[PDB]
Amino acid sequence: EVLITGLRTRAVNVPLAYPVHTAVGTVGTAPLVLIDLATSAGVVGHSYLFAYTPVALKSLKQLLDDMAAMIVNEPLAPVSLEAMLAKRFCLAGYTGLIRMAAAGIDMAAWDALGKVHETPLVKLLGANARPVQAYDSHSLDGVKLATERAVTAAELGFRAVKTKIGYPALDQDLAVVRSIRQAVGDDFGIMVDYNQSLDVPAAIKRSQALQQEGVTWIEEPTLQHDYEGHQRIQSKLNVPVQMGENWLGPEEMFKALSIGACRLAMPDAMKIGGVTGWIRASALAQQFGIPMSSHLFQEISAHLLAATPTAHWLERLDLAGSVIEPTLTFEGGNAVIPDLPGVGIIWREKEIGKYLV
Amino acid sequence: EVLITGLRTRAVNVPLAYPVHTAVGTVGTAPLVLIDLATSAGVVGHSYLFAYTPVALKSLKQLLDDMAAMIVNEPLAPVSLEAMLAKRFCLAGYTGLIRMAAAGIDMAAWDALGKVHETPLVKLLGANARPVQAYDSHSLDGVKLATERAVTAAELGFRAVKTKIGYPALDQDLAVVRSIRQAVGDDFGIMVDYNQSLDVPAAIKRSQALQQEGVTWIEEPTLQHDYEGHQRIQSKLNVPVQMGENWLGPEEMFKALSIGACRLAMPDAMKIGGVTGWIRASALAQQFGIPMSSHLFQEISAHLLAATPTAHWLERLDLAGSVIEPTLTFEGGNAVIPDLPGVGIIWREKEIGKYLV
Amino acid sequence: EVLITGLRTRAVNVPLAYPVHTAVGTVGTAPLVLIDLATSAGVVGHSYLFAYTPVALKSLKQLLDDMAAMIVNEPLAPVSLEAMLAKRFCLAGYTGLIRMAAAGIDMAAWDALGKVHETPLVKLLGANARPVQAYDSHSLDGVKLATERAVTAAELGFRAVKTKIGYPALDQDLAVVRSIRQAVGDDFGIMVDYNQSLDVPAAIKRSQALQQEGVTWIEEPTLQHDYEGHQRIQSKLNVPVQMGENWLGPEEMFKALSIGACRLAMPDAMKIGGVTGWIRASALAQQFGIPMSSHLFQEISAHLLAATPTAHWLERLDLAGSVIEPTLTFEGGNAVIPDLPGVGIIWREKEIGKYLV
Amino acid sequence: EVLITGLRTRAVNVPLAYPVHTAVGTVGTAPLVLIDLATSAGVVGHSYLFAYTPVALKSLKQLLDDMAAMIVNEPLAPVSLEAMLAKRFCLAGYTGLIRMAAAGIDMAAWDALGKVHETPLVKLLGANARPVQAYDSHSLDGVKLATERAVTAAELGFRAVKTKIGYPALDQDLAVVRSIRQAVGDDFGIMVDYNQSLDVPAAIKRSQALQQEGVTWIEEPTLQHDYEGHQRIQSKLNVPVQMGENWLGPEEMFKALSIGACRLAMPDAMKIGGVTGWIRASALAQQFGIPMSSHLFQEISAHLLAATPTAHWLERLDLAGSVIEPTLTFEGGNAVIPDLPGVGIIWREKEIGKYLV
Amino acid sequence: EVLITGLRTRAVNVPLAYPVHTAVGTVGTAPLVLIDLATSAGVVGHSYLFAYTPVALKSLKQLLDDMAAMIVNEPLAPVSLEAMLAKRFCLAGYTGLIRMAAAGIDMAAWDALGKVHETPLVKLLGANARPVQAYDSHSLDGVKLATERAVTAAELGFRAVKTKIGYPALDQDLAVVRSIRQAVGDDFGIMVDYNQSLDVPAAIKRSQALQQEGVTWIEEPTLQHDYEGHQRIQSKLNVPVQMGENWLGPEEMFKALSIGACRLAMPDAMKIGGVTGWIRASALAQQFGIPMSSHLFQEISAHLLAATPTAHWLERLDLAGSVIEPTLTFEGGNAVIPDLPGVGIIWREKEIGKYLV
Numbered sequence A, B, C, D, E: 001e002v003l004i005t006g007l008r009t010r011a012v013n014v015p016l017a018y019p020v021h022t023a024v025g026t027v028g029t030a031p032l033v034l035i036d037l038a039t040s041a042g043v044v045g046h047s048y049l050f051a052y053t054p055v056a057l058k059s060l061k062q063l064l065d066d067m068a069a070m071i072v073n074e075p076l077a078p079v080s081l082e083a084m085l086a087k088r089f090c091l092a093g094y095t096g097l098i099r100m101a102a103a104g105i106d107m108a109a110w111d112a113l114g115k116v117h118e119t120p121l122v123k124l125l126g127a128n129a130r131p132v133q134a135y136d137s138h139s140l141d142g143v144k145l146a147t148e149r150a151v152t153a154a155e156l157g158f159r160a161v162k163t164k165i166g167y168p169a170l171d172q173d174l175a176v177v178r179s180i181r182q183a184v185g186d187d188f189g190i191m192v193d194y195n196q197s198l199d200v201p202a203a204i205k206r207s208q209a210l211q212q213e214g215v216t217w218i219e220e221p222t223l224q225h226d227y228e229g230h231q232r233i234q235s236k237l238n239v240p241v242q243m244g245e246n247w248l249g250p251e252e253m254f255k256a257l258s259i260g261a262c263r264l265a266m267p268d269a270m271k272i273g274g275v276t277g278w279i280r281a282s283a284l285a286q287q288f289g290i291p292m293s294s295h296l297f298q299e300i301s302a303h304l305l306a307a308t309p310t311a312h313w314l315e316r317l318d319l320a321g322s323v324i325e326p327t328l329t330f331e332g333g334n335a336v337i338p339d340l341p342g343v344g345i346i347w348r349e350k351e352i353g354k355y356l357v
């Protein structure tokens, strides 16, 4: 009886203060699709998608725009909507860009639904808002910049940072991780991220050396889809293997966890299938005894983690900061959910115009 | 910021038109605990619990009343509340009557939360109301009465019935199913329930005979906790083994499904952990590819099934009809969710006095 | 040193004589992306992609056009090109539409490489052209039309047909298969395809009924990604379960085969990763002892099957006949590779204008 | 021919010298249900139940009182009695409070049966009394108190102590364990108990550090029901993982041991199902090669361990000391079974009146 | 339409500068069968076989000569040819010398096919030529010679060497490996090869000691066919176990990898089944997440590795240097594919006459 009455998308390419250097390439800007889901209640649901590379940006927007025809005039009922989209894309493949588009809709629909009820999303999911510990997420920065960003993060109150590694030499990975340790002291988390850049034996070798340095976790040591390879790496480690950002739907998470690919999980609110997929993922993580963190989408992830029984860390990487009001705050390194209906995303309408593609 | 302000319980032992005869004993009356959860928003959540035997009835109500102090002044946030209860009871054992009590609180809290937002529970969960196919659930009734109840159910538009079996002789099981089949015809579901009465070999022998007869499923053939035994029974059958009414929390369901105990599941809204446990349960049934039905608690299960990705059947067994307004209805054998906020449970306050224990 | 010098795409929505009705919806038209890969040797590679639904069509073409910059001036070396694309897209997700796009490029590059050496693709792969047995692939056509199409296919020399099933009732599935069987006789293959429409228990029940009827294989009985569910279905059957058209890359095929999901495979030349993915796929089917058929893309699949150690059937479903010269022919039900360099795809340039989206 | 002729229960709330602080909450008093089972032989069987929290105390007593109706007038035959109770509670769930109540009956019935035959329980089970090594069981006490209690225990002749850990920081766990080591010297056991307070990766991390300190075992590192999680923790340890106090019946122990959850077991005489369940548990522990200790109930556990083929340690935590005569003694840290019929429990009738609820 | 028109073989016994001493015997000379495959295109395909021992040399040549009857007049289509040979030797056993003979034909046929198209083999397989890192492969040389050869290899630009170990005492293995380390410095690979000489426990013991020295891999620690034994050794190592040179066909590799025998692979271009088998092996190595190196046959292996998705190292052991022109070069320790059609093998016709048997 509340119906979806419009979908508007905007492709933006937002320059970042700190380009996200990885072992497999640099993300120099954030290509985002900003989503507005109009309703017959008058409120408008907001979400966004991260396209990773500009190469995928216009394709993802086009996809969403063409998907509008299947959602406009449907009830604002995110779970029913997700089931209908799964069905419609049964043949084409309910994964990749199609799944990402469906998730952006889902996240906007839940924001709208929080607005219909005039309640923060976390409360609509039946949980209380609580502060959620966050790590400041850096990149493949080299010793000088990694040291400078680590000092800044510690001054801001964060109790952990993540760096991206996978330099040509292991000694280079170690050099950056040790330099960070000098900047932050011994009572402080250092997560490390390989971004899929190693083969299994190289990952076992580099990971055991990193484990001697006392890192908090080792994230995507090898090809994301290779769950058996992850398991093989994990079998040789005391430190936990972390993955999940590339799981497309909870069904991919289920396969990973069923064979013991990792001891931590971090679904991406977009890839996992939005709020609807995330809640399913949290049910899996709970049964499999897996502490569950977030990947990007800090705005919605602060809500989702508060509803997550095995909630672990929130990834602070502010991809949408240039176009979204800073209503999400950080007190003593913990993300604090703003007291606003739905997700608490408010567009910076003047700023958006600068970045339109 | 809606708070819980009070808890009231009432223990009743309600007469049933048809005593529930099973192979392991008769439930001749319904021992229920009726729960009222008061809130600072002025709305009152309702739910009830089934104690199975009057022997457990006063103990269950006493437990609930002693739990009142731990929930009064807590936010009305059923997910956070469930985590607090899991923690408070982790030494004593968060299972059995304690888990049942926590579930009754959970179902009242979600009823209340629905009332806070003036919305049916199904919509609060992000799904659309839809009619849910229901089977009319009977008992170990003997040939004559089973056949009558089946005809009557067919006349009312039900497309399936369940009968409870496990007579002293397999011939008797078969004579009951055959007489039902002759009276309802070939295009009609007949589910059967052994209520845990057989050892594994007897279950294989009886179940293979029933499979030759055409039954819709075979339910709890052996001891409920014996998941491996169920798996052994299932391995000898084409017809699906059904279970789940006895799973206490989604963690028991997870263990049963992890080893292939059954091809169908039917969690009990109370034993699975209320709405909170049910939603986690539905995530599991989806990943494991298990069609998921309900057990008892028809009033809330109509809502819950509507939000369940692998929704199968609703069990129609009206344990609480003597004390609850008939707002749930059946059209062509399908449960129709009432257009009322929360669950649509309204006490028949005139009738409750008759049955107070 | 042959280089890629340009990429051109054209999106078309081509009418089909017979809409492809499936249990999960109808593909009434063929949304295709037609690909031209220009090279510094003056030859032009051709391939096409199938978008399944017009909803994905513009997005897919936009993605391809945005990929033009990353392949222009790269050597015409399809294997090296595929590794570069896997790497460029490893963050975004080398699956779904992105993987499909990479595959379309791959098939054009191999077409081009064949033209560079003036040799049919099959011979470039180190194999001899041989006739490949083909089944005529039909749809959820109802009794009358299915029987007509089967007779017609028999008259044309096909030794098998595939019909799509999953009618509301199992009786309907059986009535269609029976009427086909009476009309084509005992010595004739009837494949059936459920198009992911059944849950596991329904698939076991329906499949065991069809097996009693004599069918050649049972295809995608359940959700395509549910490899474990397929394994459960297969374990209850003598008749082979068939799948693979939805595997995105040989890595998905590897996971499905590793757990015994099916006894037959049919990769889709586009989804499996083009010629490069197909060849890897054929290595896997060989080791796992899986007879391997094709899905769609009949023009290139005739070449690919000829080089496939466990080659089984070619699927005849002419999605692109309206825009591609009929150089592939059928003699006594067998696909005959044209004596032309590369794939033997020649555009009907007069007809393409009619269907441009 | 000897019959049960009465059941009397008394709820008591007994203040403890040393409140049992755990990582998941404090047990400040012992809420017990004292049980007297009258017989036609005139002797009265004595046992008690531990309710863990006062919240559960009145519910458990009520449950027992209502259960009296099923046991009065039954033969005093604990094994037959247990089978009847299992049956009666088949539907309600023979676990949790119901199972605990059944176990209290069973323990009283075996005490009575020892009295009928004028023989210590251990001799009735067909074993000789032998001294059984005991550890003095402490709590989450901090460095000052842990040190003081450790010194006292060593002076009393105990050769091991247990402390409860799970402080906010690992360095705090280590600090307490090391301080204890200073108080007791190097030839002395220090067991440690996490009381379910850690997730799997935190447990692996903390446990490997504790293992470097030379602790005797690591008890319930994670959620008690999560056997797979325990196994995962155990797989990374040389030190044994200890659990079992929360197994409700030998059927829960069987599941744990079947998947290698732990290398030690310690059933709780109440939760395991009393004497009847304990003897079954000991048969399992023997076959699985698991040294079996006791949890609480030191009075009866001294008998049961003497009949246990893989008997390991007795937990000395004197919960019922204020209301039971000190007939169980300790010589050189070994529990010495008193020469008294049955269990050797004699009520302190004057003391009981002070603690009645 | 291009046909095989002749096969000529020449048995040669070529003295080596450095006899290949192994723990199981010395290879003092290289017994090779040089192969020329004449075609109707006029070009002649070249390959060679390594017979290992002179004892096998004349038998292998005779075998090839008798096999000529099945290939002459067949199309030059290596994949079709391989399938025909597999069939013809179905009964006799398509393994050992027979398989090796088939592989020599296959390698010559692909060389010829590269020549027909006037293109380097690597380009015919659809890949670009790239430099491939090579290690200089030494033998069971003792400290003096191992040191001298290690210095030479480092001067030549190689970044790794392999030595063969399995001396009577472990201290001798360690002495040679440490002496090599002194000669090459710390930033340099030392692979070690046991040539099947140890039993599983001896291999675990020696391997853990070698692992402390920092060797790059441990190759064939035990009997080549004992995959389960390899797995057992691998289970106790962080350093990777390397094997594969003795896999006869990709079907043997598949079995090894299916049970986790090793974390690295190195097929032998001859034993694996030539180019046709190698491409299949590379598809397996990719799916199993196994970095794949080469064994001997450096001329063709430089091509094959460039087409190998998980390409690791090229083994530089120049067995055929005395009879093949040095068109393969090494720049900074990387093998550089010559710009010549096919494999780039050109006979030293004057040199061959000196070594004929």
Ligand SMILES: O=C(NO)c1ccccc1
Pocket (backbone or CB within 6 Å): A020, A022, A027, A137, A193, A195, A245, A295, A317, C091
């Ligand atoms: O792997 C990543 N994050 O954890 C990542 C990758 C690209 C951009 C931002 C983050």
Ligand SMILES: O=C(NO)c1ccccc1
Pocket (backbone or CB within 6 Å): B020, B022, B027, B193, B195, B245, B295, B317, D091
């Ligand atoms: O097994 C049962 N139902 O499916 C059942 C048992 C007791 C009372 C009501 C129902």
Ligand SMILES: O=C(NO)c1ccccc1
Pocket (backbone or CB within 6 Å): A091, C020, C022, C027, C193, C195, C245, C295, C317
């Ligand atoms: O399932 C299928 N084929 O086998 C199919 C589906 C859609 C269009 C064409 C074919």
Ligand SMILES: O=C(NO)c1ccccc1
Pocket (backbone or CB within 6 Å): B091, D020, D022, D027, D137, D193, D195, D245, D295, D317
């Ligand atoms: O975990 C425990 N003991 O080993 C425990 C818990 C509560 C009270 C007494 C003991």
Ligand SMILES: O=C(NO)c1ccccc1
Pocket (backbone or CB within 6 Å): E020, E022, E027, E137, E193, E195, E245, E295, E317
């Ligand atoms: O094991 C070997 N190489 O890696 C080997 C064996 C004999 C001759 C040459 C090499």
Ligand SMILES: [Mg+2]
Pocket (backbone or CB within 6 Å): A193, A195, A219, A220, A245
């Ligand atoms: Mg990451």
Ligand SMILES: [Mg+2]
Pocket (backbone or CB within 6 Å): B193, B195, B219, B220, B245
């Ligand atoms: Mg039942």
Ligand SMILES: [Mg+2]
Pocket (backbone or CB within 6 Å): C193, C195, C219, C220, C245
């Ligand atoms: Mg199909």
Ligand SMILES: [Mg+2]
Pocket (backbone or CB within 6 Å): D193, D195, D219, D220, D245
């Ligand atoms: Mg304990």
Ligand SMILES: [Mg+2]
Pocket (backbone or CB within 6 Å): E193, E195, E219, E220, E245
């Ligand atoms: Mg070797």
